[PDB]
Amino acid sequence: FHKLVKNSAYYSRFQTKFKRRRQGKTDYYARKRLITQAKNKYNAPKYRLVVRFTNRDIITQMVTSEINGDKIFAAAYSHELRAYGINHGLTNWAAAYATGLLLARRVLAKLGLDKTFTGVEEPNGEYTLTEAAETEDGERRPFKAILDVGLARTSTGARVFGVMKGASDGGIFIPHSENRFPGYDIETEELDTEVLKKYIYGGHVAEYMETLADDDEERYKSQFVKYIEDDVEADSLEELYAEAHKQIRADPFRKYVSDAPKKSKEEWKAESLKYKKAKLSREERKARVEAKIKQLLAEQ
């Protein structure tokens, strides 16, 4: 026998935290340093690049902070990557590079700097940053943005830096260092520059198929069921992604349509109202108490 800690007085003194911290979706300590700007520059916006990983998707956005909420500049998902010739491994590391490149090309065309700032245009495993492009007898500074990684752990070779690498090659300038890229050896503090190239084009998953097939046939059949059905082999992986990159630059606004059922915007509203539940009125709630009294009284 001891004090009941959770008594009526405990609730009264309780102070709840922020709603989005209760759900555990945001980190306000880090958020404050990302969005605040020097008061010398009055209304110059700060651009963030947020990346979130789900079970079967990758989400990328360009966000600017405002006093009454956030504003989204341009968004790119992994569903839209199907229209460019990729149908498998939608969440591997190489798929992050593709969707990272799509957003970078998508935003530059919005504000009319697509013709200049072409980028590398031939992917390579080299550590480079976008620089100013000379034009009209002058120098123009590149677009600048920063990376928001949320709550993901930033270890070496994580996919969060794949989107960073893809957008950097698009033409946007994003400051970073190379000590987190795959193929970086902490002992010699040097970057291989060849593992990176292989690891861009899906090489690591290609080696898995050939290695798994010889050692374990049945496991190789179960894990790669959908790869076999569309008879895509390890040798064909590199040319598949290389061709996808070409189509991204040619047309980034190609529309993709899914196989889910489709209706007009208004008809969906009517459908959801069928299954909604109506709150009980005060009169109905009062009437149940008398019914509860009568039946509870009769057992004893």
């Binding site: 759900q23 555990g24 979706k25 949320g150 709550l151 752990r153």
Partner: protein, 167 residues
Amino acid sequence: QNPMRELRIQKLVLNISVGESGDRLTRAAKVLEQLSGQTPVYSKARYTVRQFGIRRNEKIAVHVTVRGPKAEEILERGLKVKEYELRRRNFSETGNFGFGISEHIDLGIKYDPSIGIYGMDFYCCMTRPGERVAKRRRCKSRIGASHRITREETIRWFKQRFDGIVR
């Protein structure tokens, strides 16, 4: 209804409390390695009491944890010594249980006179599938009331699996 509410062994953790530092403890840690095949971890005395003859920041105990099929096999060896009879008070309100044995060579390790004789303690943790919800870093939450194990359920599982008895 019971589609995905079947109990299983989450982990088995077992410890030895030698109670005093020195070469004797090192021999005890030597014993525990071959039983599990993993290096064990020491523990330090956080109090400081003269009656028990221990001080702060001196190693006085060892322990190790195992998971998967290895935990299933090692638990079987321990229950053999207990001949599958446990007392009702060995099950906690959460749904876990444990016991202890006085002699560690009752099951064979090919006894050596140099190492000596030690007494070992047993404890295991039950669980249900999909308990990652309370331990993932992002969007951590609390499991529901209907999805947690009770004391009566786990003893029924123990009797049905090992055909043991409760006193």
